[PDB]
Amino acid sequence: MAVADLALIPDVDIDSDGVFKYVLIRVHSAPRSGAPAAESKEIVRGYKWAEYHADIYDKVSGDMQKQGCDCECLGGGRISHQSQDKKIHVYGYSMAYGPAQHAISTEKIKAKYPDYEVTWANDGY
């Protein structure tokens, strides 16, 4: 057996084919209840099957807790690819958890290159 680590956790995984909802979840160091520290990091999730931010929070916290972690949605919002430019955008707020720090989402997604480039606004729905 080996312990996973916060760096090995998939950092971003999102759909890219229209308009769908997303969540930003913090993850604490507890893989297999044997991780060497109590550091934390955030992960970015959002998919067309999660018609509500609670669906991704529950699903993803299930996967993280199976690894061994403990987690919390900091907030959520909506993600929208817009026809006029390839770029995706991150905006709105979770009706259940309030606005995420969408600045994290843009930093994360731009680093991870799941599509091309992204932006945010602290507004919208």
Curated annotation (Swiss-Prot):
- Known consequence of changing H102A? Decreased affinity for substrate and slightly reduced catalytic activity
Source organism, top-level taxon:
Eukaryota
User: Which BP terms from GO are recorded?
Assistant: actin cytoskeleton organization; lamellipodium organization; negative regulation of T cell receptor signaling pathway; positive regulation of cell motility; positive regulation of insulin secretion involved in cellular response to glucose stimulus
Tell me its EC number(s), please: 3.9.1.3
Reaction it catalyzes? N(pros)-phospho-L-histidyl-[protein] + H2O = L-histidyl-[protein] + phosphate; N(tele)-phospho-L-histidyl-[protein] + H2O = L-histidyl-[protein] + phosphate
> What is the main EC category here?
hydrolase
Positions where N-acetylalanine occurs in the chain: A2
Where does tissue-level expression of this protein occur?
Expressed abundantly in heart and skeletal muscle.
Q: Which residues bind substrate per the record?
A: K21, S94, M95, A96
Record's protein name: 14 kDa phosphohistidine phosphatase
**Pfam families documented for this protein:** Ocnus
